[PDB]
Write an enzyme that holds these catalytic residues in place. Structure first.
Site, mmCIF file in Angstrom:
data_model
loop_
_atom_site.group_PDB
_atom_site.id
_atom_site.type_symbol
_atom_site.label_atom_id
_atom_site.label_comp_id
_atom_site.label_asym_id
_atom_site.label_seq_id
_atom_site.Cartn_x
_atom_site.Cartn_y
_atom_site.Cartn_z
ATOM 1 N N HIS E 62 0.821 -1.205 0.000
ATOM 2 C CA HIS E 62 0.000 0.000 0.000
ATOM 3 C C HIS E 62 0.858 1.259 0.000
ATOM 4 N N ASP E 92 11.444 22.126 -29.175
ATOM 5 C CA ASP E 92 11.346 20.766 -28.668
ATOM 6 C C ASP E 92 12.302 20.594 -27.498
ATOM 7 N N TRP E 127 6.847 1.610 5.499
ATOM 8 C CA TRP E 127 7.597 2.678 4.846
ATOM 9 C C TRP E 127 8.950 2.913 5.505
ATOM 10 N N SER E 157 15.546 7.780 -12.395
ATOM 11 C CA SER E 157 14.593 8.352 -13.343
ATOM 12 C C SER E 157 14.160 9.749 -12.916
ATOM 13 N N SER E 158 13.792 9.907 -11.641
ATOM 14 C CA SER E 158 13.339 11.208 -11.161
ATOM 15 C C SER E 158 14.460 12.241 -11.221
ATOM 16 N N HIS E 241 10.988 14.314 4.198
ATOM 17 C CA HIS E 241 10.453 15.663 4.383
ATOM 18 C C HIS E 241 10.679 16.538 3.153
ATOM 19 N N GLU E 243 11.045 15.236 0.299
ATOM 20 C CA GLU E 243 10.177 14.551 -0.656
ATOM 21 C C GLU E 243 8.717 14.937 -0.457
ATOM 22 N N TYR E 245 7.853 17.954 0.463
ATOM 23 C CA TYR E 245 7.840 19.219 -0.269
ATOM 24 C C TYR E 245 7.787 18.988 -1.776
ATOM 25 N N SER E 256 -2.205 27.577 -7.980
ATOM 26 C CA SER E 256 -1.972 28.978 -8.321
ATOM 27 C C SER E 256 -2.317 29.252 -9.779
ATOM 28 N N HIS E 290 12.246 17.168 12.741
ATOM 29 C CA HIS E 290 11.271 17.400 13.797
ATOM 30 C C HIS E 290 10.491 16.142 14.154
ATOM 31 N N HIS E 291 10.906 14.984 13.637
ATOM 32 C CA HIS E 291 10.288 13.709 13.974
ATOM 33 C C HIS E 291 11.092 12.899 14.982
ATOM 34 N N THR E 316 2.986 28.817 4.887
ATOM 35 C CA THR E 316 1.751 28.083 4.618
ATOM 36 C C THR E 316 0.533 28.982 4.808
ATOM 37 N N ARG E 438 -1.498 1.608 16.483
ATOM 38 C CA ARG E 438 -1.308 1.536 15.044
ATOM 39 C C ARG E 438 -0.725 0.197 14.611
HETATM 40 C C1 HEA Z 1 0.815 9.203 -0.305
HETATM 41 C C2 HEA Z 1 0.180 9.310 0.855
HETATM 42 C C3 HEA Z 1 -0.891 8.442 1.312
HETATM 43 C C4 HEA Z 1 -2.141 8.428 0.870
HETATM 44 C C5 HEA Z 1 -2.774 9.276 -0.186
HETATM 45 C C6 HEA Z 1 -2.799 7.409 1.626
HETATM 46 C C7 HEA Z 1 -4.076 7.097 1.460
HETATM 47 C C8 HEA Z 1 -4.763 6.245 2.257
HETATM 48 N N1 HEA Z 1 -4.216 5.456 3.253
HETATM 49 FE FE1 HEA Z 1 -2.354 5.306 3.829
HETATM 50 N N2 HEA Z 1 -0.532 5.359 4.424
HETATM 51 C C9 HEA Z 1 0.499 6.152 4.037
HETATM 52 C C10 HEA Z 1 0.332 7.103 3.058
HETATM 53 C C11 HEA Z 1 -0.793 7.419 2.342
HETATM 54 N N3 HEA Z 1 -1.959 6.793 2.528
HETATM 55 C C12 HEA Z 1 1.744 5.832 4.791
HETATM 56 C C13 HEA Z 1 3.182 6.389 4.768
HETATM 57 C C14 HEA Z 1 1.386 4.833 5.626
HETATM 58 C C15 HEA Z 1 2.277 4.110 6.637
HETATM 59 C C16 HEA Z 1 2.990 3.009 5.950
HETATM 60 C C17 HEA Z 1 3.310 1.855 6.795
HETATM 61 O O1 HEA Z 1 3.758 2.145 7.919
HETATM 62 O O2 HEA Z 1 3.611 0.826 6.159
HETATM 63 C C18 HEA Z 1 0.007 4.556 5.392
HETATM 64 C C19 HEA Z 1 -0.678 3.591 6.081
HETATM 65 C C20 HEA Z 1 -1.996 3.347 6.068
HETATM 66 C C21 HEA Z 1 -2.652 2.422 6.953
HETATM 67 C C22 HEA Z 1 -1.922 1.593 8.024
HETATM 68 C C23 HEA Z 1 -1.826 0.109 7.652
HETATM 69 C C24 HEA Z 1 -2.191 -0.831 8.790
HETATM 70 O O3 HEA Z 1 -1.282 -1.171 9.561
HETATM 71 O O4 HEA Z 1 -3.218 -1.518 8.659
HETATM 72 C C25 HEA Z 1 -3.977 2.466 6.621
HETATM 73 C C26 HEA Z 1 -4.917 1.713 7.254
HETATM 74 O O5 HEA Z 1 -5.956 1.430 6.722
HETATM 75 C C27 HEA Z 1 -4.097 3.439 5.520
HETATM 76 C C28 HEA Z 1 -5.236 3.857 4.814
HETATM 77 C C29 HEA Z 1 -5.289 4.788 3.766
HETATM 78 C C30 HEA Z 1 -6.516 5.149 3.097
HETATM 79 C C31 HEA Z 1 -7.864 4.613 3.399
HETATM 80 C C32 HEA Z 1 -6.218 6.067 2.140
HETATM 81 C C33 HEA Z 1 -7.209 6.713 1.201
HETATM 82 O O6 HEA Z 1 -6.975 8.130 1.175
HETATM 83 C C34 HEA Z 1 -7.111 6.278 -0.254
HETATM 84 C C35 HEA Z 1 -7.817 7.223 -1.204
HETATM 85 C C36 HEA Z 1 -6.977 7.452 -2.431
HETATM 86 C C37 HEA Z 1 -7.489 7.601 -3.653
HETATM 87 C C38 HEA Z 1 -8.587 8.601 -3.835
HETATM 88 C C39 HEA Z 1 -6.765 7.196 -4.875
HETATM 89 C C40 HEA Z 1 -7.569 7.356 -6.170
HETATM 90 C C41 HEA Z 1 -7.010 6.543 -7.297
HETATM 91 C C42 HEA Z 1 -7.003 6.941 -8.579
HETATM 92 C C43 HEA Z 1 -7.381 6.139 -9.820
HETATM 93 C C44 HEA Z 1 -6.365 8.238 -8.879
HETATM 94 C C45 HEA Z 1 -6.940 8.950 -10.071
HETATM 95 C C46 HEA Z 1 -6.160 10.200 -10.451
HETATM 96 C C47 HEA Z 1 -5.804 10.565 -11.709
HETATM 97 C C48 HEA Z 1 -4.608 9.983 -12.381
HETATM 98 C C49 HEA Z 1 -6.593 11.545 -12.534
HETATM 99 N N4 HEA Z 1 -2.860 3.970 5.198
HETATM 100 C C1 HEA Z 2 1.594 18.189 3.173
HETATM 101 C C2 HEA Z 2 2.681 18.051 3.923
HETATM 102 C C3 HEA Z 2 2.810 18.428 5.320
HETATM 103 C C4 HEA Z 2 2.543 19.622 5.831
HETATM 104 C C5 HEA Z 2 2.050 20.852 5.139
HETATM 105 C C6 HEA Z 2 2.820 19.507 7.228
HETATM 106 C C7 HEA Z 2 2.672 20.509 8.082
HETATM 107 C C8 HEA Z 2 3.241 20.532 9.310
HETATM 108 N N1 HEA Z 2 3.728 19.425 9.978
HETATM 109 FE FE1 HEA Z 2 3.785 17.562 9.399
HETATM 110 N N2 HEA Z 2 4.044 15.821 8.644
HETATM 111 C C9 HEA Z 2 3.974 15.395 7.358
HETATM 112 C C10 HEA Z 2 3.645 16.264 6.341
HETATM 113 C C11 HEA Z 2 3.259 17.581 6.422
HETATM 114 N N3 HEA Z 2 3.258 18.249 7.581
HETATM 115 C C12 HEA Z 2 4.279 13.938 7.263
HETATM 116 C C13 HEA Z 2 4.341 12.927 6.100
HETATM 117 C C14 HEA Z 2 4.532 13.557 8.534
HETATM 118 C C15 HEA Z 2 4.890 12.153 9.029
HETATM 119 C C16 HEA Z 2 6.354 11.965 9.137
HETATM 120 C C17 HEA Z 2 6.752 11.224 10.339
HETATM 121 O O1 HEA Z 2 6.627 11.861 11.404
HETATM 122 O O2 HEA Z 2 6.630 9.989 10.245
HETATM 123 C C18 HEA Z 2 4.387 14.706 9.359
HETATM 124 C C19 HEA Z 2 4.582 14.674 10.714
HETATM 125 C C20 HEA Z 2 4.821 15.719 11.517
HETATM 126 C C21 HEA Z 2 5.379 15.621 12.840
HETATM 127 C C22 HEA Z 2 5.778 14.287 13.502
HETATM 128 C C23 HEA Z 2 5.246 14.110 14.930
HETATM 129 C C24 HEA Z 2 6.144 13.245 15.805
HETATM 130 O O3 HEA Z 2 7.224 13.736 16.172
HETATM 131 O O4 HEA Z 2 5.995 12.016 15.734
HETATM 132 C C25 HEA Z 2 5.463 16.907 13.299
HETATM 133 C C26 HEA Z 2 5.953 17.216 14.529
HETATM 134 O O5 HEA Z 2 6.270 18.341 14.802
HETATM 135 C C27 HEA Z 2 4.940 17.772 12.225
HETATM 136 C C28 HEA Z 2 4.798 19.169 12.175
HETATM 137 C C29 HEA Z 2 4.197 19.927 11.156
HETATM 138 C C30 HEA Z 2 3.997 21.355 11.240
HETATM 139 C C31 HEA Z 2 4.378 22.229 12.373
HETATM 140 C C32 HEA Z 2 3.394 21.766 10.094
HETATM 141 C C33 HEA Z 2 3.015 23.192 9.773
HETATM 142 O O6 HEA Z 2 3.865 23.654 8.712
HETATM 143 C C34 HEA Z 2 1.608 23.431 9.250
HETATM 144 C C35 HEA Z 2 1.478 24.787 8.586
HETATM 145 C C36 HEA Z 2 0.063 25.292 8.663
HETATM 146 C C37 HEA Z 2 -0.340 26.205 9.545
HETATM 147 C C38 HEA Z 2 0.593 27.317 9.903
HETATM 148 C C39 HEA Z 2 -1.749 26.342 9.967
HETATM 149 C C40 HEA Z 2 -2.620 27.189 9.032
HETATM 150 C C41 HEA Z 2 -2.237 28.637 9.057
HETATM 151 C C42 HEA Z 2 -2.415 29.439 10.119
HETATM 152 C C43 HEA Z 2 -3.559 29.421 11.127
HETATM 153 C C44 HEA Z 2 -1.517 30.604 10.241
HETATM 154 C C45 HEA Z 2 -1.301 31.093 11.648
HETATM 155 C C46 HEA Z 2 -0.685 30.042 12.563
HETATM 156 C C47 HEA Z 2 0.618 29.967 12.934
HETATM 157 C C48 HEA Z 2 1.729 30.600 12.142
HETATM 158 C C49 HEA Z 2 1.004 29.518 14.302
HETATM 159 N N4 HEA Z 2 4.550 17.012 11.138
HETATM 160 CU CU LIG Z 3 9.442 19.288 8.607
#
Ligand code: HEA
Ligand code: HEA
Ligand SMILES: [Cu+2]
Ligand SMILES: CCCCCCCCCCCCCCCCCC(=O)O[C@@H](COC(=O)CCCCCCCCCCCCCCC)COP(=O)(O)OC[C@H](O)CO
Ligand SMILES: CCCCCCCCCCCCCCCCCC(=O)O[C@@H](COC(=O)CCCCCCCCCCCCCCC)COP(=O)(O)OC[C@H](O)CO
Ligand SMILES: CCCCCCCCCCCCCCCC(=O)OC[C@H](COP(=O)([O-])OCC[N+](C)(C)C)OC(=O)CCCCCCCCCCCCCCC
Ligand SMILES: CCCCCCCCCCCCCCCC(=O)OC[C@H](COP(=O)([O-])OCC[N+](C)(C)C)OC(=O)CCCCCCCCCCCCCCC
Ligand SMILES: CCCCCCCCCCCCCCCC(=O)OC[C@H](COP(=O)(O)OCCN)OC(=O)CCCCCCCCCCCCCCC
Ligand SMILES: CCCCCCCCCCCCCCCC(=O)OC[C@H](COP(=O)(O)OCCN)OC(=O)CCCCCCCCCCCCCCC
Ligand SMILES: CCCCCCCCCCCCCCCC(=O)OC[C@H](COP(=O)(O)OCCN)OC(=O)CCCCCCCCCCCCCCC
Lengths: 40, 121, 47, 59, 534, 102, 133
Positions: E62, E92, E127, E157-158, E241, E243, E245, E256, E290-291, E316, E438
């Site tokens: 998944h 091109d 993951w 590739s990327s 992280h 990635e 972004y 935009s 920050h994780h 943000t 979890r």
């Molecule tokens: C990329 C980020 C991402 C996204 C989008 C999702 C989407 C979802 N994830 Fe997952 N998930 C992760 C990232 C993500 N997840 C990660 C990192 C983990 C932890 C991994 C682990 O530890 O192993 C995790 C784990 C995780 C678990 C934990 C597994 C467990 O131990 O059982 C579960 C549980 O059910 C879950 C559920 C879901 C569900 C219901 C969605 C739903 O949102 C799904 C909905 C998505 C769709 C809507 C896709 C549509 C498909 C299309 C055909 C696209 C069409 C588009 C065009 C090309 C035009 N996710």
């Molecule tokens: C779309 C990508 C995305 C975005 C935007 C964010 C946004 C943020 N994330 Fe998150 N984050 C992830 C993707 C993202 N994260 C992923 C994949 C993980 C899992 C990784 C791992 O832990 O396994 C994760 C996990 C994660 C953790 C891990 C927790 C732990 O340690 O286990 C933490 C901890 O600090 C964190 C912090 C934040 C913060 C502070 C923001 C902030 O930047 C949010 C910004 C938005 C706001 C600012 C709020 C709206 C605006 C306002 C109301 C303005 C005024 C407010 C203030 C300025 C205070 N993120």
């Molecule tokens: Cu970060």
């Protein structure tokens, strides 16, 4: 005139249209507690 | 099947006809005949300035209104250009589509643009 | 290499064909949409 | 040389696919890279053919 | 005739092919995630006879499939190779051989990962591949090696695609175009490509090191032998992280572009936020850790990390308010791109709110690894990637095909995915506060109703995917009908109360690029003349 | 940056000097009404005469109902009423007696 | 061309429908209207004004909004049909799944809750109700 018609909506956005915002979130109470009562 | 002097900027047509004779002994010759393909024409052009696929800017600074619309030197039917003001920048760019079937408008200058052929027999 | 207008030929499939009027290949796509998880389950367990 | 010009003239007077460049190499590679490829690919997934037929049924 | 679909020197064929591959991977991932949620619908063994090994095998399948084959390929490749060298006026794009090599090394990854998932042992560490969790003792067989090879080839590739995009931006710029006033999409792709170029090699080196450990049986990150797997953990964080972004910022650029070409007004603080995005790209190398607040770092290090992670969070909200002003004072239409962008922005505001809630380090002690963190990143990644891709498709399908798409089907599709997402994601707050543990195939039955509603939402999403494929069939079969009648939207933007019918007919689109009025994709030789702009 | 607004007005009159069709009238009306500035009766009359240079009564309806509904401006009516009354009595375009009773 | 009292069947035929009339004399009627309004207005009669306003303003062709003449009901009922399909398919797949729980009945949960909520500083006796059948 310039001042009297300025407060038609300036101060009127706190008691006239707040019902719309309140009802925009009313779905939670009707939905989730209802599901809780249904299942439990 | 005869050798070509290729001394004119326009008398050369076809990279296949150019091969380039080798040398027995001496030094590396100048970038006139040792180059293969049609790259020698391009490098000569960039050496002097007379170029094909020129990147020189057009009359962007000119308003290009109905008094003197801008010119486009290309025989291709379509047009991919733009004009949104005489200065370097004053508004978001909108593309212009000069054509002969109908007229074109600029929406900020209101210019009617006329596509410019090259003379043909 | 330069004979593609770009109206219906951009898709990497052939619209023509009486045996496959986008009916057999797309049914195969239907099958393969759920084929991989089903076979992954079937290899070790039952569905 | 005395052969590059002849080859260029032949290619100009006869435009054909496969470049008409490696006929013996093509005959050594492509039929072999088909027959031997099948002979090396098929047994790996044909060994479990006897085991094939698992219904996940136990008693 | 097959060189077009195997040796495509043009970017558009590669773009649509990447789109097809990504959509296939996404539908497979959605189906198998539905299967997983059905397994987690009720505790016990109702459809799968336990098999926690198999459970984690499909869990990692998944995660890895959707991260590496759905979000990445199409979302960057198609938009990049279709806009970035096309709007700038280049004839091109260069390096067709590099793109073809990337495509043809991809099936190595697909087949190897399929074999890795379809072996008796398999790799099921999720993951996270940090040893000794990813040790060969538990996950034996060739699964780890195949996964590593797929990682390497996908990274190559990327990286090569990013290099091609970067060189195209740096060299193929037209004469009449300033660098400071580039569109937000161009700068977004620029920042994404540079972050990818500075992030992928580190992860590739770490993955190569793990491959050497697994093959030559050396001692680098194993606990026995004086190893430090935390090095590879930090490498994986500094990949993921940035990635994250990489996955999100092109979505920001797409939103935009949509709002700019639809709302008919400029984006508030366009150049200022171009500079802000440049600052984000430059400073992303400082908030990657920050994780790891619980690994055992010093208190001062915790303070530095938290200070960085909430001092780089302002842009943000800056973008939120800038797009709010962009839709403010203008005309908004009841079109699918508007609603897609609105839903994406709203759910992104909640996701960022949860992230800010996670920003604090003191609360992390009782909040880390709870349900809240996984709920947070599921929020942000799910809405970001899925809604950005959906908005891109529904906003770009007439741009690349010219065949109109039904408005009713698009609206019902949006409603289905939206209601599914809301019903799935609302209870996660209660789930987090209770502490759902979890990654358990047989969780305690206390959360049975919430698991039921999550399964209902997942099945809604799957029937929505069925609606997606049926909508594709409907478009393919009745694009001519859609063009003939009004069953589908004909024009992107509605006229204002200033325009006459003839004037609007001859001024249908006033955008920043000729792509909208560019005819359906011409032959491989397009943009024969440079683009002039003033 | 609170830039000058009379420069765009002068651009409107210089395009009026170069006006060649109703297209330019549409463009200048859209540009003028897009701005936050409320048009004075002088520039309103200039736009009206630009629209009437082709003698298109529907454009007169457009400009009059746009003046009636240009900007909320804290719901300014009486000024709008007198302005519409005078810009109507100058030439005479009775239309509010038809669409309103609907 | 220099018409007089031009109030014919077309003038009041225009207002009713526009797409049904076959687009081959739309250009003729709009050109005739343009020629007539080239002359001084002289306070044209109301049907001609309404027709020219319709042909110049909108509510036809491009101005046709996404909101059609009853497509919103189709939207709502498509959503309802999707929900009905979801619940029906879930029910049939659950029925085809069969019984897979020989333990954890209602009485099992009752015993567990009584055991947990009988001693050891119970938080007000708990609320662990049995889930369902
Ligand atoms: C990329 C980020 C991402 C996204 C989008 C999702 C989407 C979802 N994830 Fe997952 N998930 C992760 C990232 C993500 N997840 C990660 C990192 C983990 C932890 C991994 C682990 O530890 O192993 C995790 C784990 C995780 C678990 C934990 C597994 C467990 O131990 O059982 C579960 C549980 O059910 C879950 C559920 C879901 C569900 C219901 C969605 C739903 O949102 C799904 C909905 C998505 C769709 C809507 C896709 C549509 C498909 C299309 C055909 C696209 C069409 C588009 C065009 C090309 C035009 N996710
Ligand atoms: C779309 C990508 C995305 C975005 C935007 C964010 C946004 C943020 N994330 Fe998150 N984050 C992830 C993707 C993202 N994260 C992923 C994949 C993980 C899992 C990784 C791992 O832990 O396994 C994760 C996990 C994660 C953790 C891990 C927790 C732990 O340690 O286990 C933490 C901890 O600090 C964190 C912090 C934040 C913060 C502070 C923001 C902030 O930047 C949010 C910004 C938005 C706001 C600012 C709020 C709206 C605006 C306002 C109301 C303005 C005024 C407010 C203030 C300025 C205070 N993120
Ligand atoms: Cu970060
Ligand atoms: C139990 C059996 C299965 C039910 C699930 C739905 C199956 C599909 C719908 C079957 C018919 C339902 C009853 C219809 C009564 C008459 C309504 C009618 O004529 O429908 C039209 C009028 O439209 C409507 O208002 C109805 C929409 C379609 C039907 C929606 C059904 C909803 C569910 C009904 C049953 C619910 C039972 C349980 C309650 C939750 C549909 O228009 P169209 O889609 O043909 O037009 C579009 C055009 O031709 C092509 O683009
Ligand atoms: C083995 C095959 C058995 C027969 C299956 C027939 C299926 C026919 C379609 C569904 C039943 C319709 C019964 C008759 C209804 C007539 C009223 C009407 O107009 O309703 C329309 C209702 O149809 C729709 O609204 C179409 C869309 C329905 C579904 C919309 C939401 C779908 C969401 C989920 C999709 C994925 C589901 C996956 C799981 C199943 C059907 O239009 P029509 O094509 O019959 O044209 C009738 C017209 O008046 C001309 O006479
Ligand atoms: C209990 C669990 C199941 C809960 C759900 C149970 C099933 C759903 C029940 C509610 C159904 C509401 C349908 C609204 C759409 C509709 O058709 O409303 C009618 C008008 C159409 O607009 P009109 O201009 O009046 O159309 C005229 C058409 N003629 C008459 C000329 C033919 O449209 C309107 O008035 C639009 C405004 C109405 C609200 C629109 C938003 C709908 C989505 C949110 C709904 C939230 C839930 C509301 C009900 C609780
Ligand atoms: C007061 C309650 C009012 C509503 C009553 C509805 C019925 C109900 O409460 O559920 C009865 C059972 C529940 O069944 P379940 O626990 O959800 O799933 C078990 C499936 N087995 C293992 C039997 C194959 O249902 C079943 O076992 C059959 C499946 C659901 C019913 C079939 C569809 C509707 C038919 C009418
Ligand atoms: C159950 C019974 C419900 C009865 C509702 C209809 C009453 C009569 C019709 C009417 O009063 O509508 C009141 C007017 C009628 O707009 P209009 O019909 O003139 O079309 C003109 C506009 N298209 O606004 C609307 O509907 C607006 C509908 C379009 C906008 C949809 C989104 C707005 C929020 C919808 C609700 C969201 C959830 C609730 C949030 C508070
Ligand atoms: C969305 C929320 C779903 C909640 C499901 C869990 C709570 C159970 C519940 O809420 O049950 C409330 C019932 C569920 O009926 P069911 O057969 O689906 O119950 C299945 C599990 N025993 O509602 C209804 O009967 C609504 C009518 C549905 C059609 C019934 C047709 C009867 C003839
Ligand atoms: C309480 C929960 C109940 C759930 C019921 C689920 C559905 C089961 C019954 C479905 C029967 C639908 C029959 C079609 C009715 C219809 O067509 O709709 C009636 C009309 C349809 O206008 P029109 O399409 O005919 O206009 C045709 C030309 N455009 O729409 C409405 O007035 C919407 C407002 C309803 C309030």
């Amino acid at each position: 005139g310039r001042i009297g018609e300025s407060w038609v909506i300036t101060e009127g956005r706190r008691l006239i249209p707040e019902i719309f915002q309140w009802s925009a979130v009313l779905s939670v109470c009707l939905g989730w507690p209802g599901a809780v009562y249904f299942f439990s | 099947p005869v050798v070509k002097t290729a001394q004119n900027l326009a008398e050369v047509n076809g990279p296949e006809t150019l091969i380039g004779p080798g040398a027995k002994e001496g030094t590396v010759p100048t970038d006139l005949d040792q180059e293969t393909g049609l790259a020698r024409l391009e490098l000569l052009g960039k050496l002097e300035g007379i170029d094909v696929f020129d990147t020189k800017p057009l009359d962007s600074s000119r308003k290009g209104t109905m008094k003197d619309p801008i010119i486009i030197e290309s025989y291709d039917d379509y047009r991919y250009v733009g004009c949104t003001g005489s200065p370097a920048g004053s508004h978001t760019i909108m593309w212009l589509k000069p054509t002969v079937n109908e007229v074109a408008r600029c929406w900020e200058c209101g210019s009617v643009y006329k596509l410019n052929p090259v003379g043909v027999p | 290499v330069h004979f593609k207008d770009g109206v219906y030929e951009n898709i990497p499939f052939k619209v023509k064909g009486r045996k496959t009027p986008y009916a057999l290949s797309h049914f195969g796509f239907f099958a393969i949409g759920f084929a991989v998880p089903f076979v992954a389950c079937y290899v070790q367990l039952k569905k | 040389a005395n052969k590059v010009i002849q080859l260029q003239k032949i290619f100009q007077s006869s435009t054909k696919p496969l470049w008409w460049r490696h006929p013996r190499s093509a005959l050594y590679l492509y039929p072999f890279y088909a027959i031997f490829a099948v002979a090396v690919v098929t047994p790996l997934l044909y060994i479990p053919n006897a085991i094939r037929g698992i219904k996940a049924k136990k008693a | 005739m097959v060189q077009r679909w195997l040796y495509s020197t043009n970017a558009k064929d590669i773009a649509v092919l990447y789109f097809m591959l990504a959509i296939f991977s996404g539908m497979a991932g959605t189906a198998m995630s539905l299967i997983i949620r059905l397994e987690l619908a009720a505790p016990g063994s109702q459809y799968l006879h336990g098999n926690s090994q198999l459970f984690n095998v499909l869990v990692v399948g998944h995660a890895v499939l959707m991260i590496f084959f759905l979000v990445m390929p199409a979302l960057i490749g198609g938009f990049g190779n279709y806009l970035l060298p096309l709007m700038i006026g280049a004839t091109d794009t260069a390096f067709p051989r590099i793109n073809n090599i990337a495509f043809w090394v991809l099936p190595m990854g697909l087949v190897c990962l399929v074999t890795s998932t379809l072996v008796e042992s398999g790799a099921g560490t999720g993951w996270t591949v940090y040893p000794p969790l990813s040790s060969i003792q538990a996950h034996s067989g060739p699964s780890v090696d195949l996964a590593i090879f797929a990682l390497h080839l996908t990274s190559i590739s990327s990286l090569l695609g990013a290099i091609n995009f970067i060189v195209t931006t740096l060299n193929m710029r037209t004469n009449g175009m300033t660098m400071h006033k580039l569109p937000l999409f161009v700068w977004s792709i620029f920042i994404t490509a540079f972050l990818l170029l500075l992030s992928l090699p580190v992860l590739s080196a770490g993955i190569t090191m793990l491959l050497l450990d697994r093959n030559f049986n050396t001692s680098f990150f194993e606990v026995s032998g004086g190893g430090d797997p935390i090095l590879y953990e930090h490498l994986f964080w500094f990949f993921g992280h940035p990635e994250v972004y990489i996955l999100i910022i092109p979505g920001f650029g797409i939103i935009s572009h949509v709002v700019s070409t639809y709302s008919k007004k400029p984006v508030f603080g366009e150049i200022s936020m171009v500079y802000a995005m440049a600052s984000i790209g430059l400073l992303g190398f400082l908030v990657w850790s920050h994780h790891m607040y619980i690994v055992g770092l010093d208190a001062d290090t915790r303070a530095y990390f938290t200070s960085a992670t909430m001092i780089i969070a302002i842009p943000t909200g800056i973008k939120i308010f800038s797009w709010l002003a962009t839709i403010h004072g203008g005309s908004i239409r009841l079109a699918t791109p508007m609603l897609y962008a609105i839903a994406f922005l709203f759910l992104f505001t909640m996701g960022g709110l949860t992230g800010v809630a996670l920003a604090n380090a003191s609360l992390d002690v009782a909040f880390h690894d709870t349900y809240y963190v996984v709920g947070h990143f599921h929020y942000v990644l799910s809405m970001g990637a899925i809604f950005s891709l959906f908005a891109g498709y529904y906003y770009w399908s007439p741009q690349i095909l010219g065949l109109n798409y039904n408005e009713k089907l698009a609206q019902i599709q949006f409603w289905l995915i939206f209601i599914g997402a809301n019903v799935i994601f609302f209870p996660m707050h209660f789930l987090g506060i209770n502490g759902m543990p979890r990654r358990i195939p047989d969780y305690p039955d206390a959360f049975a109703g919430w698991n039921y509603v999550a399964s209902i939402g997942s099945f809604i999403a799957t029937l929505s995917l069925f609606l997606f494929i049926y909508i594709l069939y409907d478009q393919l079969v009745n694009g001519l009908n859609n063009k003939v009648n009004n069953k589908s939207v004909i024009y992107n933007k509605a006229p204002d109360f200033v325009e006459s019918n003839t004037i609007f007919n001859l001024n249908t689109v006033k955008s920043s690029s000729i792509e909208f009025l560019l005819t359906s994709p011409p032959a491989v030789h397009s943009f024969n003349t440079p683009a002039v702009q003033s | 940056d609170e830039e000058t607004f009379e420069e765009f007005t002068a651009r409107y009159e210089k395009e009026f000097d170069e006006a060649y069709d109703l297209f330019e009238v549409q463009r200048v009306l859209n540009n003028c009404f897009s701005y936050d500035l409320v048009p004075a009766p002088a520039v309103i009359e200039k736009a009206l005469r630009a629209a009437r240079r082709v003698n298109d009564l529907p454009t007169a309806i457009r400009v009059f109902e746009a003046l009636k509904y240009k900007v909320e401006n804290e719901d300014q009516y009486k000024a709008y009423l007198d302005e519409l009354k005078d810009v109507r009595q100058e030439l005479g375009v009775p239309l509010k007696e038809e669409l309103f009773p609907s | 061309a220099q018409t007089h009292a031009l109030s014919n069947a077309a003038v009041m035929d225009l207002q009713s429908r526009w797409e049904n009339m076959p687009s081959t004399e739309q250009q003729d009627i709009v050109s005739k209207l343009s020629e007539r309004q080239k002359l001084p207005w002289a306070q044209l009669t109301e049907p001609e004004k309404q027709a020219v306003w319709y042909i110049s303003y909108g509510e036809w062709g491009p101005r046709r909004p996404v909101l059609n003449k009853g497509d919103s009901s189709f939207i709502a009922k498509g959503v309802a049909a999707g929900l009905l399909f979801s619940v029906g398919l879930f029910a049939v797949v659950r029925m085809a799944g069969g019984q897979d729980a020989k333990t954890m009945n209602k009485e099992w949960q009752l015993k567990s809750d009584e055991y947990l909520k009988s001693k050891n500083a119970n938080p007000w006796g708990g609320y662990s109700q049995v889930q369902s059948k």
